[PDB]
């Protein structure tokens, strides 16, 4: 992503942005999308989106509203 023949290709510029550093170590390649349960959409996969731990945190939260 330092090669100029890459930086001038519109279809692959996305890989030069800082948000794509070490995609494989964060589970964001095709294999990563597989073992993260993201190949599938409905029930049978709903707990994996945004992430299994993000889903768990949301279900753990105690929401104490002002007027309750």
């Amino acid at each position: 992503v330092a090669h100029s023949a890459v930086r001038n290709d519109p279809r692959i510029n996305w890989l030069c942005k800082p948000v794509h550093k070490h995609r494989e170590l964060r589970g964001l390649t095709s294999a990563g999308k597989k073992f993260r349960g993201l190949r599938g959409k409905g029930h049978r996969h709903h707990k994996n989106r945004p992430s299994r731990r993000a889903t768990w945190k949301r279900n753990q939260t105690v929401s104490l509203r002002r007027y309750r």
């Binding site: 104490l64 002002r66 007027y67 309750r68």
Partner: protein, 51 residues
């Protein structure tokens, strides 16, 4: 040491009143504004006011 039962931000700070009970109380307050004896008793100097 730490205090007994340390205060937490999830105390119940704000309490709810029924929409209708709020309106009833405003009505009572408005009426009392029209009674000279009560406006006097609440501490307002109303002694040269015409009406």
């Amino acid at each position: 040491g730490r205090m007994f039962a340390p205060t937490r931000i999830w105390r119940k700070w704000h309490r709810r009143v029924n929409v209708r009970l709020r309106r009833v109380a405003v009505a009572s307050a408005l009426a009392a504004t029209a009674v000279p004896a009560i406006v006097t008793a609440r501490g307002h100097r109303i002694e040269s006011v015409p009406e």
